Design an enzyme around this catalytic site. Sequence first.
Site, PDB file in Angstrom:
ATOM      1  N   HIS A   1       0.829  -1.193   0.000  1.00 35.28           N
ATOM      2  CA  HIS A   1       0.000   0.000   0.000  1.00 35.28           C
ATOM      3  C   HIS A   1       0.866   1.246   0.000  1.00 35.28           C
TER       4      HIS A   1
ATOM      5  N   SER B   1      -0.504  -0.592  -6.281  1.00 33.23           N
ATOM      6  CA  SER B   1      -0.431  -1.537  -7.380  1.00 33.23           C
ATOM      7  C   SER B   1       0.441  -1.019  -8.514  1.00 33.23           C
TER       8      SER B   1
ATOM      9  N   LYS C   1     -15.321  -5.001 -11.309  1.00 29.56           N
ATOM     10  CA  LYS C   1     -14.502  -5.817 -12.190  1.00 29.56           C
ATOM     11  C   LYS C   1     -14.175  -7.170 -11.542  1.00 29.56           C
ATOM     12  N   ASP C   2     -13.943  -7.188 -10.226  1.00 32.66           N
ATOM     13  CA  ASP C   2     -13.677  -8.420  -9.494  1.00 32.66           C
ATOM     14  C   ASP C   2     -14.880  -9.368  -9.499  1.00 32.66           C
TER      15      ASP C   2
ATOM     16  N   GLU D   1       0.199 -34.320  -5.210  1.00 33.31           N
ATOM     17  CA  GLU D   1      -0.837 -33.562  -5.890  1.00 33.31           C
ATOM     18  C   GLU D   1      -0.237 -32.744  -7.027  1.00 33.31           C
TER      19      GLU D   1
HETATM   20  C1  HEM Z   1      -3.325 -16.102  -0.221  1.00 32.07           C
HETATM   21  C2  HEM Z   1      -2.561 -15.723  -1.250  1.00 32.07           C
HETATM   22  C3  HEM Z   1      -2.620 -14.335  -1.778  1.00 32.07           C
HETATM   23  C4  HEM Z   1      -3.614 -13.366  -1.755  1.00 32.07           C
HETATM   24  C5  HEM Z   1      -5.027 -13.415  -1.154  1.00 32.07           C
HETATM   25  C6  HEM Z   1      -3.080 -12.243  -2.443  1.00 32.07           C
HETATM   26  C7  HEM Z   1      -3.810 -11.064  -2.669  1.00 32.07           C
HETATM   27  C8  HEM Z   1      -3.356  -9.992  -3.424  1.00 32.07           C
HETATM   28  C9  HEM Z   1      -4.134  -8.852  -3.767  1.00 32.07           C
HETATM   29  C10 HEM Z   1      -5.632  -8.675  -3.439  1.00 32.07           C
HETATM   30  C11 HEM Z   1      -3.298  -8.002  -4.457  1.00 32.07           C
HETATM   31  C12 HEM Z   1      -3.683  -6.655  -5.073  1.00 32.07           C
HETATM   32  C13 HEM Z   1      -4.519  -6.974  -6.339  1.00 32.07           C
HETATM   33  C14 HEM Z   1      -3.742  -7.784  -7.372  1.00 32.07           C
HETATM   34  O1  HEM Z   1      -2.685  -7.376  -7.919  1.00 32.07           O
HETATM   35  O2  HEM Z   1      -4.067  -8.925  -7.755  1.00 32.07           O
HETATM   36  C15 HEM Z   1      -2.011  -8.589  -4.477  1.00 32.07           C
HETATM   37  C16 HEM Z   1      -0.914  -8.014  -5.091  1.00 32.07           C
HETATM   38  C17 HEM Z   1       0.324  -8.650  -5.024  1.00 32.07           C
HETATM   39  N1  HEM Z   1       0.659  -9.877  -4.570  1.00 32.07           N
HETATM   40 FE1  HEM Z   1      -0.557 -11.134  -3.830  1.00 32.07          FE
HETATM   41  N2  HEM Z   1      -1.836 -12.500  -2.837  1.00 32.07           N
HETATM   42  C18 HEM Z   1      -1.493 -13.732  -2.475  1.00 32.07           C
HETATM   43  C19 HEM Z   1      -0.319 -14.418  -2.684  1.00 32.07           C
HETATM   44  C20 HEM Z   1       0.802 -13.855  -3.241  1.00 32.07           C
HETATM   45  C21 HEM Z   1       1.992 -14.515  -3.598  1.00 32.07           C
HETATM   46  C22 HEM Z   1       2.292 -16.002  -3.423  1.00 32.07           C
HETATM   47  C23 HEM Z   1       2.845 -13.529  -4.103  1.00 32.07           C
HETATM   48  C24 HEM Z   1       4.246 -13.635  -4.594  1.00 32.07           C
HETATM   49  C25 HEM Z   1       5.041 -14.711  -4.725  1.00 32.07           C
HETATM   50  C26 HEM Z   1       2.180 -12.285  -4.113  1.00 32.07           C
HETATM   51  C27 HEM Z   1       2.799 -11.117  -4.508  1.00 32.07           C
HETATM   52  C28 HEM Z   1       1.998 -10.023  -4.752  1.00 32.07           C
HETATM   53  C29 HEM Z   1       2.563  -8.832  -5.359  1.00 32.07           C
HETATM   54  C30 HEM Z   1       4.019  -8.567  -5.717  1.00 32.07           C
HETATM   55  C31 HEM Z   1       1.528  -7.976  -5.509  1.00 32.07           C
HETATM   56  C32 HEM Z   1       1.580  -6.584  -6.135  1.00 32.07           C
HETATM   57  C33 HEM Z   1       1.296  -6.824  -7.618  1.00 32.07           C
HETATM   58  C34 HEM Z   1       0.957  -5.526  -8.324  1.00 32.07           C
HETATM   59  O3  HEM Z   1      -0.128  -4.893  -8.137  1.00 32.07           O
HETATM   60  O4  HEM Z   1       1.729  -5.169  -9.182  1.00 32.07           O
HETATM   61  N3  HEM Z   1       0.942 -12.534  -3.581  1.00 32.07           N
HETATM   62  N4  HEM Z   1      -2.067  -9.824  -3.858  1.00 32.07           N
HETATM   63  C1  HEM Z   2      -5.471 -22.502   2.605  1.00 30.61           C
HETATM   64  C2  HEM Z   2      -6.531 -23.128   3.105  1.00 30.61           C
HETATM   65  C3  HEM Z   2      -6.646 -24.596   2.979  1.00 30.61           C
HETATM   66  C4  HEM Z   2      -6.187 -25.469   2.019  1.00 30.61           C
HETATM   67  C5  HEM Z   2      -5.341 -25.152   0.799  1.00 30.61           C
HETATM   68  C6  HEM Z   2      -6.635 -26.766   2.403  1.00 30.61           C
HETATM   69  C7  HEM Z   2      -6.317 -27.936   1.699  1.00 30.61           C
HETATM   70  C8  HEM Z   2      -6.821 -29.174   2.054  1.00 30.61           C
HETATM   71  C9  HEM Z   2      -6.662 -30.339   1.282  1.00 30.61           C
HETATM   72  C10 HEM Z   2      -5.919 -30.475  -0.040  1.00 30.61           C
HETATM   73  C11 HEM Z   2      -7.308 -31.344   1.926  1.00 30.61           C
HETATM   74  C12 HEM Z   2      -7.415 -32.758   1.365  1.00 30.61           C
HETATM   75  C13 HEM Z   2      -8.848 -32.769   0.793  1.00 30.61           C
HETATM   76  C14 HEM Z   2      -9.349 -34.109   0.293  1.00 30.61           C
HETATM   77  O1  HEM Z   2      -8.818 -34.604  -0.720  1.00 30.61           O
HETATM   78  O2  HEM Z   2     -10.285 -34.735   0.871  1.00 30.61           O
HETATM   79  C15 HEM Z   2      -7.902 -30.824   3.100  1.00 30.61           C
HETATM   80  C16 HEM Z   2      -8.619 -31.603   3.994  1.00 30.61           C
HETATM   81  C17 HEM Z   2      -9.117 -31.023   5.149  1.00 30.61           C
HETATM   82  N1  HEM Z   2      -9.079 -29.715   5.520  1.00 30.61           N
HETATM   83 FE1  HEM Z   2      -8.266 -28.282   4.562  1.00 30.61          FE
HETATM   84  N2  HEM Z   2      -7.358 -26.667   3.535  1.00 30.61           N
HETATM   85  C18 HEM Z   2      -7.398 -25.394   3.940  1.00 30.61           C
HETATM   86  C19 HEM Z   2      -8.025 -24.837   5.053  1.00 30.61           C
HETATM   87  C20 HEM Z   2      -8.632 -25.606   6.048  1.00 30.61           C
HETATM   88  C21 HEM Z   2      -9.135 -25.073   7.247  1.00 30.61           C
HETATM   89  C22 HEM Z   2      -9.099 -23.602   7.655  1.00 30.61           C
HETATM   90  C23 HEM Z   2      -9.654 -26.102   7.975  1.00 30.61           C
HETATM   91  C24 HEM Z   2     -10.257 -25.858   9.309  1.00 30.61           C
HETATM   92  C25 HEM Z   2     -10.145 -26.947  10.037  1.00 30.61           C
HETATM   93  C26 HEM Z   2      -9.465 -27.306   7.211  1.00 30.61           C
HETATM   94  C27 HEM Z   2      -9.908 -28.552   7.543  1.00 30.61           C
HETATM   95  C28 HEM Z   2      -9.714 -29.647   6.714  1.00 30.61           C
HETATM   96  C29 HEM Z   2     -10.180 -30.978   7.139  1.00 30.61           C
HETATM   97  C30 HEM Z   2     -10.952 -31.325   8.425  1.00 30.61           C
HETATM   98  C31 HEM Z   2      -9.842 -31.837   6.141  1.00 30.61           C
HETATM   99  C32 HEM Z   2     -10.071 -33.354   6.109  1.00 30.61           C
HETATM  100  C33 HEM Z   2     -11.408 -33.796   5.520  1.00 30.61           C
HETATM  101  C34 HEM Z   2     -11.321 -33.840   4.013  1.00 30.61           C
HETATM  102  O3  HEM Z   2     -10.473 -34.474   3.365  1.00 30.61           O
HETATM  103  O4  HEM Z   2     -12.105 -33.175   3.344  1.00 30.61           O
HETATM  104  N3  HEM Z   2      -8.861 -26.943   6.038  1.00 30.61           N
HETATM  105  N4  HEM Z   2      -7.576 -29.477   3.155  1.00 30.61           N
HETATM  106  C1  LIG Z   3     -12.335  -5.666   5.027  1.00 34.80           C
HETATM  107  C2  LIG Z   3     -11.231  -4.733   5.540  1.00 34.80           C
HETATM  108  C3  LIG Z   3      -9.882  -5.450   5.633  1.00 34.80           C
HETATM  109  C4  LIG Z   3      -9.035  -5.124   4.372  1.00 34.80           C
HETATM  110  C5  LIG Z   3      -8.466  -6.389   3.622  1.00 34.80           C
HETATM  111  C6  LIG Z   3      -9.602  -7.078   2.826  1.00 34.80           C
HETATM  112  C7  LIG Z   3      -9.243  -7.569   1.410  1.00 34.80           C
HETATM  113  C8  LIG Z   3      -8.912  -6.316   0.587  1.00 34.80           C
HETATM  114  O1  LIG Z   3      -8.003  -5.546   0.749  1.00 34.80           O
HETATM  115  O2  LIG Z   3      -9.727  -6.127  -0.495  1.00 34.80           O
HETATM  116  C9  LIG Z   3      -9.525  -5.668  -1.801  1.00 34.80           C
HETATM  117  C10 LIG Z   3     -10.831  -5.837  -2.552  1.00 34.80           C
HETATM  118  C11 LIG Z   3      -8.348  -6.462  -2.396  1.00 34.80           C
HETATM  119  N1  LIG Z   3      -8.325  -6.250  -3.836  1.00 34.80           N
HETATM  120  C12 LIG Z   3      -7.355  -5.270  -4.250  1.00 34.80           C
HETATM  121  O3  LIG Z   3      -6.608  -4.760  -3.492  1.00 34.80           O
HETATM  122  C13 LIG Z   3      -7.301  -4.940  -5.716  1.00 34.80           C
HETATM  123  C14 LIG Z   3      -6.441  -3.947  -6.093  1.00 34.80           C
HETATM  124  C15 LIG Z   3      -6.351  -3.634  -7.427  1.00 34.80           C
HETATM  125  C16 LIG Z   3      -7.178  -4.311  -8.356  1.00 34.80           C
HETATM  126  C17 LIG Z   3      -8.007  -5.354  -7.969  1.00 34.80           C
HETATM  127  N2  LIG Z   3      -8.909  -6.016  -8.916  1.00 34.80           N
HETATM  128  C18 LIG Z   3      -8.637  -5.735 -10.303  1.00 34.80           C
HETATM  129  O4  LIG Z   3      -9.443  -6.077 -11.022  1.00 34.80           O
HETATM  130  C19 LIG Z   3      -8.089  -5.625  -6.634  1.00 34.80           C
HETATM  131  O5  LIG Z   3      -8.977  -6.613  -6.230  1.00 34.80           O
HETATM  132  C20 LIG Z   3      -8.464  -7.906  -2.115  1.00 34.80           C
HETATM  133  O6  LIG Z   3      -9.071  -8.735  -2.719  1.00 34.80           O
HETATM  134  O7  LIG Z   3      -7.796  -8.329  -0.974  1.00 34.80           O
HETATM  135  C21 LIG Z   3      -8.112  -9.316  -0.040  1.00 34.80           C
HETATM  136  C22 LIG Z   3      -7.021 -10.361  -0.108  1.00 34.80           C
HETATM  137  C23 LIG Z   3      -8.145  -8.635   1.311  1.00 34.80           C
HETATM  138  O8  LIG Z   3      -8.424  -9.634   2.264  1.00 34.80           O
HETATM  139  C24 LIG Z   3      -7.333  -9.921   3.196  1.00 34.80           C
HETATM  140  O9  LIG Z   3      -6.239  -9.455   3.016  1.00 34.80           O
HETATM  141  C25 LIG Z   3      -7.642 -10.884   4.389  1.00 34.80           C
HETATM  142  C26 LIG Z   3      -7.708 -12.322   3.874  1.00 34.80           C
HETATM  143  C27 LIG Z   3      -8.942 -12.633   3.018  1.00 34.80           C
HETATM  144  C28 LIG Z   3      -6.485 -12.601   2.999  1.00 34.80           C
END
Ligand code: HEM
Ligand code: HEM
Ligand SMILES: CCCCCC[C@H]1C(=O)O[C@H](C)[C@H](NC(=O)c2cccc(NC=O)c2O)C(=O)O[C@@H](C)[C@@H]1OC(=O)CC(C)C
Lengths: 244, 63, 124, 71, 85, 383, 54
Positions: free
Chosen positions: F202, F206, F228-229, F272
């Site tokens: 921030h 972006s 757009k999202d 996987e």
């Molecule tokens: C739970 C996984 C993630 C969530 C929810 C997440 C969410 C977001 C969001 C909402 C933005 C701003 C909107 C966008 O550009 O798409 C953002 C930007 C960014 N994220 Fe992620 N992200 C995740 C994982 C990652 C990972 C694995 C990386 C890098 C290895 C990454 C690097 C970045 C970077 C560098 C930006 C800025 C990109 C830009 O606007 O130019 N994020 N992310």
């Molecule tokens: C990033 C978030 C998460 C990812 C990527 C993820 C991924 C997975 C995967 C790959 C499995 C194996 C599913 C299958 O083949 O049956 C699984 C099973 C499970 N996950 Fe998650 N998980 C997430 C979050 C959570 C959370 C927050 C809970 C809260 C407890 C949870 C509870 C479980 C349980 C109870 C199972 C076993 C039952 C089943 O296989 O469906 N997971 N998860």
């Molecule tokens: C609720 C108050 C807490 C503030 C965090 C809430 C979320 C938040 O920041 O929202 C925004 C909507 C954000 N998107 C952007 O920045 C964005 C910026 C530029 C362009 C686009 N799209 C283009 O086409 C965008 O979508 C987004 O998706 O981010 C989530 C990940 C955030 O959730 C969290 O981190 C908490 C948890 C779910 C990871």
Amino acid sequence: MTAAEHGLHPAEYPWPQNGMLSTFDHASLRRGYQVYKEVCAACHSLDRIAWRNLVGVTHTTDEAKAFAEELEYDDEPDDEGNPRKRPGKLADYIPGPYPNEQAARAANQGALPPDLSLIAKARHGGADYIFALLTGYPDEPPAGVVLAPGMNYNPYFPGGGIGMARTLFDGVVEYEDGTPATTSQMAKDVAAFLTWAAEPEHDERKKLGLKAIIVISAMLGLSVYIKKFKWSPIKNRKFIYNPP
Amino acid sequence: GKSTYKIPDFTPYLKKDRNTDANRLFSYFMIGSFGMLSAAGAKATVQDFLSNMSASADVLAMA
Amino acid sequence: ASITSVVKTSELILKSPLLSKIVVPLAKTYVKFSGYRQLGFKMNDLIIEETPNMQLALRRLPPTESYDRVYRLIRATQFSLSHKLATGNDITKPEEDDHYLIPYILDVEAEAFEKDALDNLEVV
Amino acid sequence: PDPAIALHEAAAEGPCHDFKHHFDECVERVTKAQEAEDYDHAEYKEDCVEEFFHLQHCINDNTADKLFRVL
Amino acid sequence: YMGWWGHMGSPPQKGIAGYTISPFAARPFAGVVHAAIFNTFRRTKNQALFVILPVSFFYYVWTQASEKNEWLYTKAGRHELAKAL
Amino acid sequence: MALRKKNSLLNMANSYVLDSPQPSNLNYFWNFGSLLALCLVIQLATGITLAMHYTSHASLAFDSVEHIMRDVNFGWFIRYAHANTASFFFICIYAHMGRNIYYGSYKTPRVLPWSIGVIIFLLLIITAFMGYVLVFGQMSLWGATVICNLVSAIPWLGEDIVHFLWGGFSVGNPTLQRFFALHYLMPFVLAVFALLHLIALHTAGSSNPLGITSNVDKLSMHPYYSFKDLITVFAFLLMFTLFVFFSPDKLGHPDNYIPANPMVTPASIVPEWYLLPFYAILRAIPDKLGGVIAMVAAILILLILPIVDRSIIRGNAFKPISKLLFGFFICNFLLLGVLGQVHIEPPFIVLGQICTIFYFSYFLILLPMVSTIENIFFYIGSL
Amino acid sequence: ATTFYNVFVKRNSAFVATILASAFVFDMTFETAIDNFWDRINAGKQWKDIRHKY
Ligand code: HEM
Ligand code: HEM
Ligand SMILES: CCCCCC[C@H]1C(=O)O[C@H](C)[C@H](NC(=O)c2cccc(NC=O)c2O)C(=O)O[C@@H](C)[C@@H]1OC(=O)CC(C)C
Ligand code: HEC
Ligand SMILES: CCCCCCCCCCCCO[C@@H]1O[C@H](CO)[C@@H](O[C@H]2O[C@H](CO)[C@@H](O)[C@H](O)[C@H]2O)[C@H](O)[C@H]1O
Ligand SMILES: CCCCCCCCCCCCO[C@@H]1O[C@H](CO)[C@@H](O[C@H]2O[C@H](CO)[C@@H](O)[C@H](O)[C@H]2O)[C@H](O)[C@H]1O
């Protein structure tokens, strides 16, 4: 790997349930239950299915209660703490042919017949694999194949030598609906039944999917209209520059 | 090009009936339909999903 | 990489007759396929500006160059979001693609690099 | 009788005839080789699994739909 | 490197006039057919090589590798397999 | 003053979802961030619900998953949603990382959000690995065994560390119960890091597809990017619908419907799909410890992109040679994925080694060379 | 159009009330329509179709 080591890939048969909008054929499910009960159940359990599961799928409440009531299940001990049996109820699970693995292997020359409740999901191919395997025992193994003792040649099985012999022969079952019980017919019915056993939500899941698809598609179309509506002032913006 | 009082050409985009109630109503019909499907979809989702917490089939069998 | 590095290496190449004969045609085709001129940019408009050195060089631009750069960025942003290309006078012609910023950044970096050297001087 | 029997026979004699002949020739060779002495002390013992698979795969392609249509 | 509304960090702007019209006054899908056909064709044609070249190369490499592997595990490929291991 | 600006709590939300100033030209590859937020919300909702019906004890685990499928109302949906969304989470994360590499999002001044992003990606991998074990089918058990035995490669203490991770001498009940507790926790940690990487972003805002400043021309996050999202939310839900309702097992392994059996070894133990490229990199190195280091390095090397990219221009929109190299890098990463699930056989062994070398040489040789030459081409070409 | 706008759209309270009422009606009618359609494309296959024999 050799093709033999993988096993031959089964044909894709046109199952009634293939098709985004298609249910199982419940009449085939009922017939397949009868093949399970009269052929497979000698060696294979179906432990994840309860009598109540058949009701409104293949059988009425009364037919399923009748199946359950013919069997004896372990009750709670009596008042002197001695063991007791009771007749079965709809809540009970379909009982297996063997008390344990050791008994199962002893009856099957060492091989363990798997529980069939998940078998359609636990094998690549699903229903097609089950149908292919049951109908794919050649009269003679291909020349050169040496079977281990107690093995039968079946090309669909990986490695080719399976511990289960051919069991479906024309007329081993007499269907209660008058359908001719050929090898192919029984293999198709039992494969359908086992597919149902592995995924009993199938019919409901696909109907809910249809509803989801329709709603989500409509919402996708409307979200495009609304995005374009809101964005048009940005997209349509024009500039005139007069260098200062 | 130079005069800022000469508005650029917006004729490719302008609707003739832009000030009418019919014009506004149409766009609110789209917004409304979208809100309607989102409400119906949310209700379906919430109901189906939360029903996991109600007695499961094996619990009802023993009742 | 520093603008200084890029400019000096390029000057080494332009000096060598052989090197220039082979590099200058490639560089010109590269620039044609790059396609930044089809959004009405000049090459220097693309240089990363989020560093202290570049922010200083941008502050030193004459006001007219600075106002025109602002317009070209806004105009390119509008072509980008519309998925359109410049047409007519908006296309940057090769003769308009002038290095308006390079001299300012070379002076900023010359000072910065001299400062680094002089911070490490040893009285002999 | 089993509809599959007739459908399979028809497919082997018809669209899958080349593969039928390959399997047959393979079987002839292998059986003849087994008949010969010092076969048990050979390095490589040929089978006909490959040819069998090519034939079965072909029969299945020409029959699957037809079979399920008559069940 | 970013401020906020009113002090975003832009160099001073002057001399640019911007114009636009209300979303209610505009046709949101004006020129959609032309865009969908001609604009998309232009955009796709200009990027096509950057997709085609790597995809076609890696698909070719994979196809050759998978076909060789299949052949090595047949009867005919016995000898070549023996050398490969 | 508006309440949204005056009240400190409202103002924090306002700063991220409403008044947040964004570039006006973000393309659809900027939608993956909110899709990743959607996957996270679905995994939390479905995962916590599964946890209400699942039993982590090895004697009951596999059967509790069958109980969910068969007896719990809509249990089949909640389970299939959770299992498929885990795959979608990785599709979205690879798209998001691909966008970041193509557009130079890792360059200054965005090194810190990129670096926290690399940790998010590692946390996703661990989370998904542990979740998959919880089913306690054949692939669950055997995948846990092989992956946890990689730790045995740590010199001197490796074996001790493995026994400590397992809570015993093989993967069993202690392992499963600890994986449940950690699988529940790790998504909360991941949500924190996701928030951290956005707070870090921030400060610069972006980036945008042109690679230039957007300080000249900003748009509010709402309504423009909100609406757009929504488009891609519904596109995602359509894809989700087709897998969950019509093909719920397409992305899975049939062997995970067989209960774990320490005696019988499955024909092939593969991870996987989303872990397959890392597995191919591991196989490429003959040494055990070598292979482990290479596999970790394949992820950690993302941290050096801010250094090895020597370009004076952010992102690839205007760089034809960089675009070609990026295309080869991506396709090589997909080929590594395919090679991760072939048998260890000729000629896939050598192919996996060549692809592994190319993967690393992109960071260490090709990108620094190409970015250096393009700098010179831009300068000479526009003289 | 004026009348319709004035009654159902102008006040957000009324607009939201109309959207929610419409969602309720949609939900009930769509359920019934899908049920009938699903039964026709899967005719003779479902339990409800064979139940009468038993
Ligand atoms: C739970 C996984 C993630 C969530 C929810 C997440 C969410 C977001 C969001 C909402 C933005 C701003 C909107 C966008 O550009 O798409 C953002 C930007 C960014 N994220 Fe992620 N992200 C995740 C994982 C990652 C990972 C694995 C990386 C890098 C290895 C990454 C690097 C970045 C970077 C560098 C930006 C800025 C990109 C830009 O606007 O130019 N994020 N992310
Ligand atoms: C990033 C978030 C998460 C990812 C990527 C993820 C991924 C997975 C995967 C790959 C499995 C194996 C599913 C299958 O083949 O049956 C699984 C099973 C499970 N996950 Fe998650 N998980 C997430 C979050 C959570 C959370 C927050 C809970 C809260 C407890 C949870 C509870 C479980 C349980 C109870 C199972 C076993 C039952 C089943 O296989 O469906 N997971 N998860
Ligand atoms: C609720 C108050 C807490 C503030 C965090 C809430 C979320 C938040 O920041 O929202 C925004 C909507 C954000 N998107 C952007 O920045 C964005 C910026 C530029 C362009 C686009 N799209 C283009 O086409 C965008 O979508 C987004 O998706 O981010 C989530 C990940 C955030 O959730 C969290 O981190 C908490 C948890 C779910 C990871
Ligand atoms: C009297 C014994 C016996 C009968 C009758 C029997 N099976 Fe089996 N079955 C076995 C044995 C033993 C195995 C294990 C074979 C092995 O692993 O080598 C087996 C294995 C299977 C497999 C798994 C093959 C695999 O891929 O692992 C399926 C599916 C199968 N049976 C289904 C059936 C069906 C359907 C029927 C009858 C309609 C049936 N069986 C009748 C003994 C039997
Ligand atoms: C703030 C929100 C308010 C509280 C939320 C309410 C939570 C639970 C409400 C109802 C849940 C159960 O409500 C019940 O749900 C299931 C679907 O979910 C419906 O069941 C209906 O659809 C399902 C599949 O969608 C079919 O298997 C079934 O044959 C059919 O009758 C019942 O018709 C309804 O009675
Ligand atoms: C869903 C779980 C997440 C819950 C946390 C809720 C908010 C998410 C992050 C908030 C924590 C940091 O948010 C903090 O808020 C201030 C004030 O709004 C923000 O400040 C931002 O907006 C203000 C005014 O709107 C500008 O003057 C400032 O230039 C800008 O940086 C910063 O981004 C950050 O320092």
